[PDB]
Write a protein that binds this ligand. Structure first.
Ligand SMILES: *[C@@H]1O[C@H](CO)[C@@H](O)[C@H](O)[C@H]1NC(C)=O
Lengths: 55, 49
């Protein structure tokens, strides 16, 4: 998918059809840090285990 | 964006997106250098066309 933003929030959607989704840990994969990538933006990625770990 | 579109092209040959983003500066130079050799290759030898 591709990250999109309606100007306020951030979503991940399939590249061929606007179906915005919450940016969870499963929707994405991690490789590296904030240095190398040009154009990176700041936001929060939801972790599905937070309600389970807390409860 | 053209930086992002090439990540689609890279992702279509079995290479993940982050390979392009982490090496975008190297890749842009490789693309630019290879294009420049095209003019020389046609300009040097006239049997190309
Ligand atoms: C996009 O171009 C603008 C031109 O004003 C520049 O300021 C900005 O750094 C660029 N952003 C990215 C993410 O490449």
């Amino acid at each position: 998918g591709v990250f999109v933003s309606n100007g306020t929030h951030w979503f991940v959607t399939q590249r061929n059809f606007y179906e915005p989704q919450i940016i969870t840990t499963d929707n994405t994969f991690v490789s590296g840090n904030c240095d190398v990538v040009i154009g990176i933006v700041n936001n929060t990625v939801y972790d599905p285990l937070q309600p389970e770990l807390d409860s | 964006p053209f930086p992002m579109q090439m990540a689609y092209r890279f992702n279509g040959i079995g290479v993940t997106q982050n390979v392009l983003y982490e090496n975008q500066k190297l890749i842009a130079n490789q693309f630019n250098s290879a294009i420049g050799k095209i003019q020389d290759s046609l300009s040097s030898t006239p049997s190309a066309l």
